[PDB]
Design an enzyme around this catalytic site. Structure first.
Site, mmCIF file in Angstrom:
data_model
loop_
_atom_site.group_PDB
_atom_site.id
_atom_site.type_symbol
_atom_site.label_atom_id
_atom_site.label_comp_id
_atom_site.label_asym_id
_atom_site.label_seq_id
_atom_site.Cartn_x
_atom_site.Cartn_y
_atom_site.Cartn_z
ATOM 1 N N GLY A 60 -63.114 -57.400 -12.017
ATOM 2 C CA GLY A 60 -64.243 -58.138 -11.504
ATOM 3 C C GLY A 60 -65.101 -58.667 -12.622
ATOM 4 O O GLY A 60 -64.836 -58.465 -13.796
ATOM 5 N N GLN A 61 -66.165 -59.371 -12.243
ATOM 6 C CA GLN A 61 -67.107 -59.850 -13.247
ATOM 7 C C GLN A 61 -67.813 -58.690 -13.947
ATOM 8 O O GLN A 61 -67.792 -58.591 -15.182
ATOM 9 C CB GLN A 61 -68.126 -60.791 -12.625
ATOM 10 C CG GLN A 61 -68.977 -61.436 -13.667
ATOM 11 C CD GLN A 61 -70.014 -62.345 -13.097
ATOM 12 O OE1 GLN A 61 -69.694 -63.410 -12.569
ATOM 13 N NE2 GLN A 61 -71.277 -61.930 -13.182
ATOM 14 N N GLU A 115 -60.769 -64.556 -10.476
ATOM 15 C CA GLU A 115 -61.288 -65.882 -10.720
ATOM 16 C C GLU A 115 -61.375 -66.116 -12.223
ATOM 17 O O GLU A 115 -61.753 -65.200 -12.969
ATOM 18 C CB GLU A 115 -62.667 -66.031 -10.053
ATOM 19 C CG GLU A 115 -63.536 -67.062 -10.701
ATOM 20 C CD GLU A 115 -64.905 -66.517 -10.955
ATOM 21 O OE1 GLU A 115 -65.275 -65.495 -10.323
ATOM 22 O OE2 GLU A 115 -65.581 -67.055 -11.857
ATOM 23 N N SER A 138 -67.655 -53.225 -10.477
ATOM 24 C CA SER A 138 -68.849 -53.147 -9.636
ATOM 25 C C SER A 138 -68.495 -52.613 -8.252
ATOM 26 O O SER A 138 -67.411 -52.878 -7.737
ATOM 27 C CB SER A 138 -69.508 -54.515 -9.485
ATOM 28 O OG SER A 138 -68.675 -55.387 -8.740
ATOM 29 N N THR A 184 -64.174 -58.650 -5.508
ATOM 30 C CA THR A 184 -63.149 -58.236 -6.459
ATOM 31 C C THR A 184 -63.440 -56.848 -7.009
ATOM 32 O O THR A 184 -62.568 -55.977 -7.017
ATOM 33 C CB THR A 184 -63.048 -59.240 -7.597
ATOM 34 O OG1 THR A 184 -62.990 -60.561 -7.068
ATOM 35 C CG2 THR A 184 -61.835 -58.987 -8.438
ATOM 36 N N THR A 226 -76.412 -60.544 -6.481
ATOM 37 C CA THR A 226 -76.144 -61.896 -6.021
ATOM 38 C C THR A 226 -75.795 -61.957 -4.536
ATOM 39 O O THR A 226 -75.640 -63.058 -4.003
ATOM 40 C CB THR A 226 -74.965 -62.479 -6.802
ATOM 41 O OG1 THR A 226 -74.663 -61.643 -7.931
ATOM 42 C CG2 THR A 226 -75.345 -63.865 -7.320
ATOM 43 N N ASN A 266 -77.718 -50.504 -11.484
ATOM 44 C CA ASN A 266 -78.338 -51.609 -12.215
ATOM 45 C C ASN A 266 -79.861 -51.553 -12.173
ATOM 46 O O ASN A 266 -80.528 -52.042 -13.091
ATOM 47 C CB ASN A 266 -77.871 -52.946 -11.666
ATOM 48 C CG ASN A 266 -76.741 -53.547 -12.482
ATOM 49 O OD1 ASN A 266 -76.393 -53.044 -13.549
ATOM 50 N ND2 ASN A 266 -76.147 -54.615 -11.972
ATOM 51 N N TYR A 283 -77.686 -60.006 -18.097
ATOM 52 C CA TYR A 283 -76.517 -59.134 -18.081
ATOM 53 C C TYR A 283 -76.152 -58.686 -19.492
ATOM 54 O O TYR A 283 -75.688 -57.551 -19.680
ATOM 55 C CB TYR A 283 -75.328 -59.817 -17.413
ATOM 56 C CG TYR A 283 -75.386 -59.831 -15.900
ATOM 57 C CD1 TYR A 283 -75.868 -58.739 -15.164
ATOM 58 C CD2 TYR A 283 -74.958 -60.949 -15.206
ATOM 59 C CE1 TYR A 283 -75.918 -58.792 -13.763
ATOM 60 C CE2 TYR A 283 -74.999 -61.004 -13.844
ATOM 61 C CZ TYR A 283 -75.471 -59.945 -13.119
ATOM 62 O OH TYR A 283 -75.481 -60.111 -11.747
ATOM 63 N N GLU A 302 -60.292 -32.896 -19.452
ATOM 64 C CA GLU A 302 -61.447 -32.039 -19.689
ATOM 65 C C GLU A 302 -62.667 -32.530 -18.923
ATOM 66 O O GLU A 302 -63.488 -31.713 -18.481
ATOM 67 C CB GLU A 302 -61.749 -31.979 -21.181
ATOM 68 C CG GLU A 302 -61.392 -30.677 -21.840
ATOM 69 C CD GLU A 302 -61.660 -30.712 -23.335
ATOM 70 O OE1 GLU A 302 -62.825 -30.449 -23.737
ATOM 71 O OE2 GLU A 302 -60.704 -31.005 -24.100
#
Ligand SMILES: Nc1nc2c(ncn2[C@@H]2O[C@H](COP(=O)(O)OP(=O)(O)OP(=O)(O)O)[C@@H](O)[C@H]2O)c(=O)[nH]1
Ligand SMILES: Nc1ncnc2c1ncn2[C@@H]1O[C@H](COP(=O)(O)OP(=O)(O)CP(=O)(O)O)[C@@H](O)[C@H]1O
Ligand SMILES: Nc1nc2c(ncn2[C@@H]2O[C@H](COP(=O)(O)OP(=O)(O)O)[C@@H](O)[C@H]2O)c(=O)[nH]1
Ligand SMILES: COc1ccc2c(c1)NC(=O)CN2c1nc(Cl)nc2ccc(F)cc12
Ligand SMILES: [Ca+2]
Ligand SMILES: [Mg+2]
Ligand SMILES: [Mg+2]
Lengths: 427, 437, 328, 53
Positions: free
Chosen positions: B10-11, B71, B140, B145, B179, B206, B224, B254
């Site tokens: 993903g992004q 993408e 994420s 994705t 988003t 986040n 970001y 471990e």
């Protein structure tokens, strides 16, 4: 991710044409198709809307459709008329006489396949086609009746691409003929079923904004359409320019539409301006934010205080503090948190783009999925049954094949739509 | 030596992967072209960094990394970035159409057409590995994705590598930088389908990273790249033991042994101090005790919550820099008195400490200041269940109306997977609450 | 304009906090489930503390202290006194207490047997263990038992028991505010020693008085009681009782400050407590119960709820004093 | 407070410190459920194409 634009009939071609002017100026493309701009931000996503032609020229991915040669010839004669790929002018000669049936069933039927052929040539060029956006009015016959017939056929050929319209609502304050409520109720039925996203550009709201707020005593379509091109540039910002968002039609539909039939958005714009006269003080981020949520800035004659916001997208254009935007946007929610649904957490999203539109230093475009849009669909349902209870003017349509039943269904689907918007205003 | 493969999805996964891999290269002295002057075993070695890098006959050092985005936009910036030469084209896998923030679109619709191509470039890497440990999976919760492809990948990995460990670094959804409004759907869905496939997962809300960036870095609106450089610092802290000489957390097994006694409750809270702005011209360097105390302040945690109102089952202190055992135990002893640190009765109250003498590395021209000593506490406290309650409330609010559900059903999924995933989560919050009362 | 939701509809006190708050024209009540609030006047059980302080651009404050229950539950208040060294198993202001579940009490009861000393206790009051221990199992839940204060201070005319309730407010900064108005909940029934089954003469619960003879509502405020001390005992309320009360409030709340402070937290707590004391015949003050959800006495509701708003609510959300700051 | 397993080296050291003592599905099943969602898709899409027809 290419988009395919289609503008159909008198109204769809006139606003269609302004859109391409306006955004051709924002991307530094001139009436010849040659780029003459300053920033690279103008060309990084130019392909979403333009095809790149040999000689490194840009040709709008625009299909121009009318049952009449009138307006379309005026486009070709207009300022940017030469930019449009000439093969993409598809038009009959009989006209549709402001008659939904002629658009949808008789006259439009003859011409629709030729439109579908230019659509196909454009789609095949495409690398990853997002979908389609249509500009039309719902009150005449071509854009209304044929327009929705196209939308039906596109969805059959491309069932899994996004369908977006800019639909101009009719209004007794700006009305060509008395059958507009008939034409629009028939179209609204189509739109509920076959679009992902429709922007409700009410001619009632454009008129009042021209009269009350811009103080235009006698507003032309050119005045209304200045408002329409401002909103259209606005809502398409986050598709044409690079930003943190970098959005597309599908993500837009996923986040804005919690229930499939409730996809009718109230656009809004700030500052409201009137053509030619430029005022010289830029707004303050607090001003954009109060104005853009102001009912006086909504382009659908609905009172947002009579519904709840299901979802909201807001786009800020110009050099400004994303801190103050964050703060001013968080403040209007927590001040008027009653008018946002509790059951979609964090339903207001915001984006910013550095390039402002021409003429203004700073601007805010508002996209609201409010349940107050039902007020629009009620207004039209009232005008519809005011005549239909006496079967008035119906012969114009029974003469082209249609049945009374078809009207009862369309009337009925719209009253359903209004009931559905009413369900969530109490939830 | 045993290799570890990093999978960035993903992004959020890819951009954080970039942040980390760039940090790794700085810390290991590898350059943007993969030449490591200091490596003298040319074209090979079973050194400790070789767990994250392979060497080339031409002596290049190459991430044991796979990037995968539905993408092309984000992984393309990798393909053209300062570290373009570092990676090998077939490790940067991109689709064409993304998941549109739709768990079901990334898992079912678009997931099915790439899950094979991906598990193949993954196995191409597993085949250059003499004794593969397992996978570090970066994603994420929120993206379609990020959430949906990741759980499809996680399911197959459990199948093709049943004996290898899988660790997660998961970005938990925060509205400020978010988003999409459907992130709570995607979060619950992917947690439920990934739970039994992940051996250990470190959540990074986040919200927490953003406010650390505003407070302790004086960054007005964190980007970001602000959040990702700070997040890769924490990631580095947690992986250093795999990439450096040491005796604590030397292998991915471990991590489960030291931090995960019960297997479902495998979400260790990370706390990190000190985060000091590079703009501050005059900075008084913080001590072992000051920075160990900062590990028990919520404003330093990767997730905001209150460990005083939970119970611990494990605790690691990972120091980097000028730190000696004696200073640690004095700071632990001083802190034990003043803080409310309650373990579960079946676990010893006590810390596993790890110290690496190389002080933290800061990418030149970042926002973090060099510091003489840093620490990253990993603690399995039940108080992190607070984040599950938050996420699960948001989910109940939308789902009671079935808002947005149609987008999911319209790709294959059944309203049932929604309530099934939510019942797992309800099981999860009950597990936690049992352990912590 | 600040905003606030309401989630304890039975709160006599915050019923009034809500009222006054609105009447400022700067506060607005939202729907209980609206998340975009500044101020949570919360529920009493399962208040959702893990959801406060995650709303960007919203400073959030709540009227309870997560963890405070440890001081406001009979069984946990005992555990707090014995285990916390700050209080010590030896504190001179708490009666002997043991937690006995129903499925060292006897030891000390027998060291008392060896002296034939008073051996009355409470839950419910008995003198023989077997009488009591058989009661807790007759209910099924956890109970605690405590040295009954056989020799309490009795007001005359009446030869009558009482307890003192002081209202204490802890703000987001952990200032400790004692309300100047206290209240004595007085029994109208001459305390009789042998008959420990004479409820209403041993239990000074306002409700239990299901009266009004000597004072309105079996309630004596501070002006009256200090005067009686002055006349009948040649002392004052401050010297004989209040000094020890401010020591106990201060000590209890200093103890749990590390466990409940919201000093660096992402949301904030204040809370109002009712402290209940027993004054014995030697003019020694005793702590019985600490009540976390306290009702005020009607005469003072106006005063105390306006003081909450000033000290606990407007301190954070801005638009002589009725409290004594207890200094630490 | 008991230190327990001091291991050193050139890079750093490690050790524990006790303050107090105590008091999967198949590839087939994947492809099955996955392919059930692609049928559920093709149904929903054929109804759409039926209704258009
Ligand atoms: N910390 C951090 N979080 C990120 C970053 N990029 C995205 N996110 C978070 O990820 C969430 C959405 O997931 P994404 O990774 O962006 O989506 P995706 O994985 O590309 O999946 P798609 O829906 O197909 O785009 C958002 O809420 C962001 O807060 C990043 O670079 N750093
Ligand atoms: N150790 C002791 N010695 C003598 N009398 C005692 C005592 N402990 C309590 N009492 C008296 O007996 C009563 C016992 O009831 P209890 O204290 O549980 O009611 P309560 O304080 O829970 C009501 P509220 O919660 O409203 O304050 C006390 O209120 C006090 O009047
Ligand atoms: N805002 C706006 N509305 C228009 C314009 N032209 C027509 N309309 C509206 O559209 C309706 C007429 O439909 P029209 O598009 O002209 O008929 P068509 O050519 O068959 O599609 C009327 O109700 C008008 O109010 C225009 O330029 N701007
Ligand atoms: C309410 O929640 C969302 C609303 C809208 C969007 C979104 C989430 N997330 C997305 O990726 C697409 N997106 C947007 N799309 C487009 Cl075309 N324009 C926009 C302009 C401003 C803006 F704030 C968002 C968008
Ligand atoms: Ca080597
Ligand atoms: Mg016309
Ligand atoms: Mg993406």
């Amino acid at each position: 991710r290419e988009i395919v634009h289609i503008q159909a009939g008198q109204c769809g071609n006139q606003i269609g044409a302004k859109f391409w002017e306006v955004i051709s100026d924002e991307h530094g493309i001139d009436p010849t198709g040659s780029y003459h701009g300053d920033s690279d931000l103008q060309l990084e996503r130019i392909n979403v809307y333009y095809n790149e032609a040999t000689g490194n020229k840009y040709v709008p991915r625009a299909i121009l459709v009318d049952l009449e040669p009138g307006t379309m010839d005026s486009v070709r004669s207009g300022p940017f008329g030469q930019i449009f790929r000439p093969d993409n002018f598809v038009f009959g000669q009989s006209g549709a006489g402001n008659n939904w049936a002629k658009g949808h069933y008789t006259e439009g039927a003859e011409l629709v396949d030729s439109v579908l052929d230019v659509v196909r040539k454009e789609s095949e060029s495409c690398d990853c086609l997002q979908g389609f956006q249509l500009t039309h009015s719902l009150g005449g016959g071509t854009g209304s009746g044929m327009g929705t017939l196209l939308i039906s056929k596109i969805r059959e050929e491309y069932p899994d691409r996004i369908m977006n319209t800019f639909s101009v609502m009719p209004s007794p304050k700006v009305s060509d003929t008395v059958v507009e409520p008939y034409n629009a109720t028939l179209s609204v039925h189509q739109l509920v079923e076959n679009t992902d996203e429709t922007y409700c550009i009410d001619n009632e709201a454009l008129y009042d904004i021209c009269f009350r707020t811009l103080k235009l005593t006698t507003p032309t379509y050119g005045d209304l359409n200045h408002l329409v091109s401002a909103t259209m540039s606005g809502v398409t910002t986050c598709l044409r320019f690079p930003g943190q968002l970098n959005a597309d039609l599908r993500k837009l539909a996923v986040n804005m539409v919690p229930f499939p039939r409730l996809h009718f958005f109230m656009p809004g714009f700030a500052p409201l301006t009137s053509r030619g006269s430029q005022q010289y003080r830029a707004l303050t981020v607090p001003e954009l934010t109060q104005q853009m949520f102001d009912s006086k800035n909504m382009m659908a004659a609905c009172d947002p205080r009579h519904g709840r916001y299901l979802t909201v997208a807001a786009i800020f254009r110009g050099r400004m503090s994303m801190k103050e935007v964050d703060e001013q946007m968080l403040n209007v929610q927590n001040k008027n948190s009653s008018y946002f649904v509790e059951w979609i957490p964090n339903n207001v999203k915001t984006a910013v783009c550095d390039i402002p539109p021409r003429g203004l230093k700073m601007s805010a475009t508002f996209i609201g999925n409010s349940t107050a849009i039902q007020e629009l669909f009620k207004r039209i349902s009232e005008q519809f049954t005011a005549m239909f209870r006496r079967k008035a003017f119906l012969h114009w349509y029974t003469g082209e094949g249609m049945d009374e039943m078809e009207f009862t269904e369309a009337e009925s689907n719209m009253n359903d739509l209004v009931s559905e918007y009413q369900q969530y205003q109490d939830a | 030596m045993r290799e570890c493969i990093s999978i960035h999805v993903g992004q959020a996964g890819v951009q954080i992967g970039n942040a980390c891999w760039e940090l790794y290269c700085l810390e290991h002295g590898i350059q943007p072209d993969g030449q490591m002057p200091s490596d003298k075993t040319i074209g090979g070695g079973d050194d400790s960094f070789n767990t994250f890098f392979s060497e080339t006959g031409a002596g290049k050092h190459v991430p044991r990394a796979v990037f995968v985005d539905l993408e092309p936009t984000v992984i393309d910036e990798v393909r053209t970035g300062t570290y373009r030469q570092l990676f090998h084209p077939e490790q940067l896998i991109t689709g064409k159409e993304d998941a549109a923030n739709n768990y079901a679109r990334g898992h079912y619709t678009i997931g099915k057409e790439i899950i094979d191509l991906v598990l193949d470039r993954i196995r191409k890497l597993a085949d250059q590995c003499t004794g593969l440990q397992g996978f570090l999976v970066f994603h994420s919760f929120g993206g379609g994705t990020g959430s949906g492809f990741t759980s499809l990948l996680m399911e197959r990995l459990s199948v093709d590598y049943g004996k290898k460990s899988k660790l997660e670094f998961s970005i938990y959804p925060a509205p400020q930088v978010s988003t999409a409004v459907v992130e709570p759907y995607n979060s619950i869905l992917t947690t439920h389908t990934t739970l039994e496939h992940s051996d250990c997962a470190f959540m990074v809300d986040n919200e927490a990273i953003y406010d650390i960036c505003r407070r302790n870095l004086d960054i007005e609106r964190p980007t970001y790249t602000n959040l990702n450089r700070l997040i890769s610092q924490i990631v580095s802290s947690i992986t250093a033991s795999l990439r450096f000489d040491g005796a604590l957390n030397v292998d991915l097994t471990e991590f489960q042994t030291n931090l995960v006694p019960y297997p479902r409750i495998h979400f260790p809270l990370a706390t990190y101090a000190p985060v000091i702005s590079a703009e501050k011209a005059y900075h008084e360097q913080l001590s072992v005790a000051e920075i160990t105390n900062a590990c028990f302040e919520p404003a330093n945690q990767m997730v905001k919550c209150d460990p005083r109102h939970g119970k611990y089952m494990a605790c690691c202190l990972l120091y980097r820099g000028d730190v000696v055992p004696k200073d640690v135990n004095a700071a632990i002893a001083t802190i034990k008195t003043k803080r409310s640190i309650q373990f579960v009765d079946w676990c010893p109250t006590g810390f596993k400490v790890g110290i690496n003498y190389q002080p933290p590395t800061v990418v030149p021209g970042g926002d973090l200041a060099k510091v003489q000593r840093a620490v990253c506490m990993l603690s399995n406290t039940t108080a992190i269940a607070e984040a599950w309650a938050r996420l699960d409330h948001k989910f109940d609010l939308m789902y009671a109306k079935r808002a947005f559900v149609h987008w999911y059903v319209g790709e294959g999924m059944e309203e049932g997977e929604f309530s099934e995933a939510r019942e797992d989560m309800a099981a999860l919050e009950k597990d936690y609450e049992e352990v912590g009362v | 304009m600040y905003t606030f939701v309401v989630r304890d509809e039975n709160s006599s006190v915050y019923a009034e906090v809500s009222r006054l708050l609105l009447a400022t024209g700067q506060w607005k009540r939202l729907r209980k489930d609206n998340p975009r609030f500044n101020l949570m006047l919360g529920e009493r059980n399962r208040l959702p503390f893990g959801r406060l302080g995650h709303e960007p651009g919203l400073v959030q404050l709540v009227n309870y202290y997560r963890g405070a229950d440890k001081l406001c539950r009979k069984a946990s208040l005992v555990k707090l006194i014995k285990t916390s060294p700050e209080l010590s198993e030896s504190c001179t202001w708490f009666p002997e207490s043991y937690v006995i579940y129903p499925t060292v009490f006897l030891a000390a009861y027998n060291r008392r047997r060896e002296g034939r000393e008073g051996n009355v206790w409470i839950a419910l009051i008995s003198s023989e263990a077997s009488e009591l221990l058989d009661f807790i199992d007759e209910q099924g839940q956890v109970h605690v038992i405590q040295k009954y204060l056989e020799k309490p201070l009795l007001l005359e005319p009446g030869h009558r028991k009482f307890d003192i309730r002081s209202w204490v407010l802890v703000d987001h900064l952990y200032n400790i505010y004692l309300y100047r108005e206290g209240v004595l909940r007085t029994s109208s029934e001459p305390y009789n020693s042998a008959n420990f089954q004479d409820k209403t003469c041993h239990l000074t619960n306002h409700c239990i008085q299901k009266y009004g003879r000597y004072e309105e509502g079996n309630e004596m405020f501070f002006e009256e009681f200090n005067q009686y001390l002055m006349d009948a005992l040649n002392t004052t309320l401050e010297n004989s009782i209040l000094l020890q009360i401010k020591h106990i409030i201060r000590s209890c709340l200093m103890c749990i400050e590390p466990a409940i402070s919201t000093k660096h937290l992402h949301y904030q707590s204040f809370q109002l407590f009712g402290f209940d004391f027993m004054v014995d015949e030697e003019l020694k003050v005793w702590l019985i119960e600490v009540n976390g959800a306290p009702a005020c006495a009607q005469k003072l509701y106006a005063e105390l709820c306006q003081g909450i708003v000033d000290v606990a609510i407007s301190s954070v959300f801005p638009l002589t004093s009725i409290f004594i700051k207890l200094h630490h | 407070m008991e230190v327990i397993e001091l291991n050193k080296c050139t890079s750093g050291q490690s050790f524990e410190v006790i303050l107090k003592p105590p008091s999967d599905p198949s590839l087939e099943e994947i492809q099955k459920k996955l392919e059930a969602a692609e049928e559920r898709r093709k149904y929903q899409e054929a109804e759409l194409l039926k209704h258009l027809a």
